[PDB]
Amino acid sequence: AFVVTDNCIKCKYTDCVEVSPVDCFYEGPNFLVIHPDECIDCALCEPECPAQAIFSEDEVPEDMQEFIQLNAELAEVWPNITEKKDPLPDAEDWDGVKGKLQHLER
Ligand code: SF4
Ligand code: F3S
Numbered sequence: 001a002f003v004v005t006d007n008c009i010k011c012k013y014t015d016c017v018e019v020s021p022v023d024c025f026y027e028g029p030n031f032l033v034i035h036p037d038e039c040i041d042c043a044l045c046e047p048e049c050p051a052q053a054i055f056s057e058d059e060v061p062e063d064m065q066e067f068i069q070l071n072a073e074l075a076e077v078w079p080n081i082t083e084k085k086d087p088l089p090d091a092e093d094w095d096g097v098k099g100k101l102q103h104l105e106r
Helices: 066-075
Strands: 002-004 025-027 032-034 054-056
Touching: 002 032, 002 066, 032 066
Parallel strands: none
Antiparallel strands: 002 054, 025 032
């Protein structure tokens, strides 16, 4: 399973969803998560995230380990997304800000 981590919060470019062969991504207000039972680890998405937020589960940084379980839990409540859409409005101002998990909306 690939894991979407912090920097996607408040950026949500959705460039990642075009490349996906299965419907692995599930959509929230300002973040996207990958459903771990459905990702087939094709690795195609992580070169596409402008925010460089997608990691192989085995490569999620020490300080971002929360995300592995977050992606699994939210993937069970959030709707599947399959079309790219426009990035959230202020996406570049937040790209690269650390500590964005305090801003996650459900
Ligand atoms: S690695 Fe592939 S199957 Fe997995 S979330 Fe990315 S695009 Fe989807
Ligand atoms: S910022 Fe998020 S919506 Fe996808 S393209 Fe990157 S993981």
